[PDB]
Design a binder for these strands. Structure first.
Ligand SMILES: Nc1nc2c(ncn2[C@@H]2O[C@H](COP(=O)(O)OP(=O)(O)CP(=O)(O)O)[C@@H](O)[C@H]2O)c(=O)[nH]1
Ligand SMILES: [Mg+2]
Ligand SMILES: [Mg+2]
Ligand SMILES: [Mg+2]
Ligand SMILES: [Mg+2]
Ligand SMILES: [Mg+2]
Ligand SMILES: [Mg+2]
Ligand SMILES: [Mg+2]
Ligand SMILES: [Mg+2]
Ligand SMILES: [Mg+2]
Ligand SMILES: [Mg+2]
Ligand SMILES: [Mg+2]
Ligand SMILES: [Mg+2]
Ligand SMILES: [Mg+2]
Ligand SMILES: [Mg+2]
Ligand SMILES: [Mg+2]
Ligand SMILES: [Mg+2]
Ligand SMILES: [Mg+2]
Ligand SMILES: [Mg+2]
Ligand SMILES: [Mg+2]
Ligand SMILES: [Mg+2]
Ligand SMILES: [Mg+2]
Ligand SMILES: [Mg+2]
Ligand SMILES: [Mg+2]
Ligand SMILES: [Mg+2]
Ligand SMILES: [Mg+2]
Ligand SMILES: [Mg+2]
Ligand SMILES: [Mg+2]
Ligand SMILES: [Mg+2]
Ligand SMILES: [Mg+2]
Lengths: 81, 56, 205, 145
RNA sequence: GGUCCAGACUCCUACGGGAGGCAGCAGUGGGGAAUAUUGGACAAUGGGCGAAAGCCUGAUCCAGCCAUGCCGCGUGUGUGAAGAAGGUCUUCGGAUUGUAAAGCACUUUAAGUUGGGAGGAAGGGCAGUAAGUUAAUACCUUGCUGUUUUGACGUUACCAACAGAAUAAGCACCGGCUAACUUCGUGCCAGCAGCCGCGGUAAUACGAAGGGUGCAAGCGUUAAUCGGAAUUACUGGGCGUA
RNA sequence: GAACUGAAGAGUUUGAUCAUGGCUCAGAUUGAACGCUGGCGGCAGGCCUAACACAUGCAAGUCGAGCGGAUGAAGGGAGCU
């Protein structure tokens, strides 16, 4: 199906994540349909920990996209704030 | 390996074995020692190889 | 790497002051600084335009004690930046942490300020920095660690920096050895003998 | 912390390998070469400037003139490796090794083939041994190689 | 990393009779100037199945090797004129190596030892409570509360203490182009060379030694692309005699 | 407010000169190789040749809440011990 998951970038022991809407049978860092924000496990300082597009996320969830476990938790946390 | 195949894991003080993992083919009469220090073994082997080429 | 060796043949070869000793006693009464180093010292040997450009670049590099690859990086950054790379290079060289510590009177020379910085005795924004290339920004407060405030080196360096000229772009708080970087010193704040046009000419070839 | 005038002689740290020239030894001693050769004329058989001199006599002459002598190893890796590799305690008995030698067809393969029950002499090109064979067997009494 | 047929090539065999496909991750032989470990874990992000625990995952996350590249940091800092001893050159007066060394006094980054110490962790099991679903204080789903439980990397990043200057500099070049010069050997030899060109008895060009100039954990050489080349000229060339 | 800003020549044909014209050099780059030398770390990279042949391990399984069957715990017990 179509899912929303985390694509890993950054560098060794310094991970950065893009919240990506992908066909499920693609590479983790391969082709995607749309990026709807990012997540920073380290952040600190002026860096934000995570940001999401509410509009795009709701639109894709309304079209039948299944988010992962981390994407579900992070999206509900973002909606909490 | 031991004599008749069937790979083993340890070799005692007077048991002939077949070791697999060297880089080149040694010659009979050479002695082998366990170094337990990668860098020392590699540099000593390089030094010995240089001396061997020079003497040849 | 680092140039470690006789730090006065450089002055004789460049032919200028090119401060490398503490300046306590003198320069003339240590080396007879009027001849090029080596056996063929009495010869004059007028040299060519490429030689003049090379000598200018070497003089700047030996003044600030940086090697060739880092200097090329500095030149590329100065060219990338806006507004007349010629003094951009000097702006960028005059902001290194070792040079700033030297200008504040904490060290007698650049080598001793490098000794201090590398050996974890300097804090920039209340936190330790030990990279003698850290580009300090306007408004930082270079200080000395409390466990390193009783070194004599700082005492002689301060009492000897008391008479070399007023920098007038850093304020040193002498009693407790704390400084402040107001801004980068403009071209008119440095000596008007370096011909940076020769450096830019040399690298643009 | 000004200038203090030195009083006594000059002492150095001379380094000597397997062999050295008299000129090099004098150079590391900060003395004129012709002096050192002269010092041989007053002690046993003289030498020349360029003749290759050994290590024992080099150390002797360097210590005779009051210098700190520290030598070096030509193959220091081997001594460094050997030194920090051989240190252990404890001791146990081991199975004995034994070799079998003799004339051509006197029957040294058949004896081992009976002791092991292996009948390897049936094969073998030309009915002769051309490779050294090493076996570990459990005899009626104990283990033997 | 499925089936069938045919083929080339290897192998098994008890001679009746079958099997195989590393251009998956390690690894071997071979070819070559030349390119690495039979490593660890599913802790993290993903994928398959499951209802859910959970199972699988050479994807992935990490470790090992190699100056292959880029970047950063060390190999100490100040004073020190008997301008020591030795080397080299000399007009034999001296100059230079050179504040360089020694001496004196400081500092401990990195490396060594010891002790502290995050962040990568979301979740899962159990127990309780409240809402919705019904027909129901059932099951179940969802908020929350309490307890328990998870990290390969890993002796993590980072931080504090101890000792001592202690553990750490080489490579190319010096006739012009092109920064940097003299002596000694050799004598159209031995040799050098990118192009002009050096060497036939005073060679700043060969080989050493003193000195110096460039770079610097690298420095040179070889191979290859563009540039300079307006030398295929669109931008931007020419054709009387080149 | 920014997203640019940018262009060097020299040696060699002659007794000397100008032109034409070729050769060579000074720069920046490599998945590089070789020679000499070699302390540390961070981030990357690593069969360009034989789509040559491959010993040995692992790389794709899961569902008992779809279905028979056989494996048959702890226990409740019953008898003898
Ligand atoms: N009658 C008899 N024959 C024997 C005896 N031992 C060996 N042989 C015979 O001798 C022949 C060779 O014996 P073998 O064991 O091959 O000798 P070898 O010394 O091993 C051969 P090489 O020296 O080359 O290794 C065999 O054919 C065997 O039958 C024995 O005790 N008795
Ligand atoms: Mg570097
Ligand atoms: Mg035999
Ligand atoms: Mg026979
Ligand atoms: Mg396969
Ligand atoms: Mg493979
Ligand atoms: Mg194949
Ligand atoms: Mg080969
Ligand atoms: Mg290689
Ligand atoms: Mg996993
Ligand atoms: Mg199960
Ligand atoms: Mg498996
Ligand atoms: Mg595994
Ligand atoms: Mg490295
Ligand atoms: Mg190399
Ligand atoms: Mg002298
Ligand atoms: Mg944690
Ligand atoms: Mg010149
Ligand atoms: Mg001569
Ligand atoms: Mg030449
Ligand atoms: Mg020469
Ligand atoms: Mg080329
Ligand atoms: Mg062109
Ligand atoms: Mg070209
Ligand atoms: Mg045209
Ligand atoms: Mg033309
Ligand atoms: Mg014509
Ligand atoms: Mg004609
Ligand atoms: Mg001519
Ligand atoms: Mg290939």
């Amino acid at each position: 199906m179509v899912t929303i998951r985390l694509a890993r970038g950054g560098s060794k022991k310094r991970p950065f994540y893009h919240l990506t809407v992908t066909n499920s049978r693609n590479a983790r860092d391969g082709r995607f349909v749309e990026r709807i924000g990012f997540f920073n496990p380290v952040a600190t300082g002026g860096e934000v920990r995570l940001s999401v597009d509410q509009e795009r996320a709701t639109y894709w969830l309304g079209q039948g996209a299944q988010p992962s476990e981390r994407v579900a938790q992070l999206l509900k946390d973002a909606a909490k704030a | 390996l031991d004599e008749n195949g069937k790979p083993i894991k340890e070799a005692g003080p007077s048991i002939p074995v077949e070791i697999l993992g060297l880089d080149g083919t040694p010659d009979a009469g050479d002695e082998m020692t366990v170094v337990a220090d990668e860098k020392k073994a590699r540099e000593v082997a390089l030094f010995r190889q240089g001396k061997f080429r020079e003497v040849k | 790497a680092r140039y470690i060796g006789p730090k006065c043949k450089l002055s004789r070869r460049e032919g200028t002051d090119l401060f490398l000793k503490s300046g306590a006693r003198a320069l003339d009464s240590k080396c007879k600084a009027e001849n090029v180093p080596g056996q063929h010292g009495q010869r004059r040997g007028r040299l060519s335009d490429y030689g003049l450009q090379l000598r200018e670049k070497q003089k700047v590099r030996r003044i600030y004690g940086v090697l060739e690859r880092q200097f090329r990086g500095y030149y590329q950054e100065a060219s990338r930046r806006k507004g007349s790379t010629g003094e951009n290079l000097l702006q960028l060289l005059e902001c290194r942490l070792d040079n700033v510590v030297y200008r504040m009177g904490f060290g007698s020379t650049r080598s001793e300020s490098r000794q201090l910085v590398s050996h974890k005795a300097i804090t920039v924004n209340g936190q330790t920095v030990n990279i003698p290339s850290y580009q300090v920004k306007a408004g930082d407060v270079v200080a000395v660690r409390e466990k390193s405030k009783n070194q004599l080196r700082i005492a002689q360096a301060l009492e000897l920096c008391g008479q070399r000229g007023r920098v007038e772009w850093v304020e040193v708080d002498l009693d407790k050895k704390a400084g402040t970087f107001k801004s980068a010193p403009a071209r008119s704040d440095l000596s008007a003998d370096i011909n940076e046009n020769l450096i830019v000419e040399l690298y643009s070839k | 912390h000004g200038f203090q005038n030195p009083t006594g002689p000059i002492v150095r740290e001379v380094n000597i390998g397997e062999t050295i020239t008299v000129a090099e030894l004098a150079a590391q001693m900060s003395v004129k070469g012709a002096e050192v050769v002269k010092f041989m004329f007053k002690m046993g058989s003289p030498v020349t400037i360029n003749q290759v001199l050994d290590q024992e006599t080099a150390q002797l002459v360097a210590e005779e003139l009051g210098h700190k002598v520290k030598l070096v190893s030509e193959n220091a890796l081997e001594e460094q490796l050997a030194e920090s590799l051989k240190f252990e305690g404890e001791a146990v008995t081991r199975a004995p090794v034994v070799t079998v030698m003799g004339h051509v067809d006197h029957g040294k393969t058949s004896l081992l083939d009976y002791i092991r029950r292996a009948k390897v002499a049936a094969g073998e090109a030309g009915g002769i041994t051309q490779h050294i064979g090493a076996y570990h067997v459990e005899t009626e009494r104990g283990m033997v190689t």
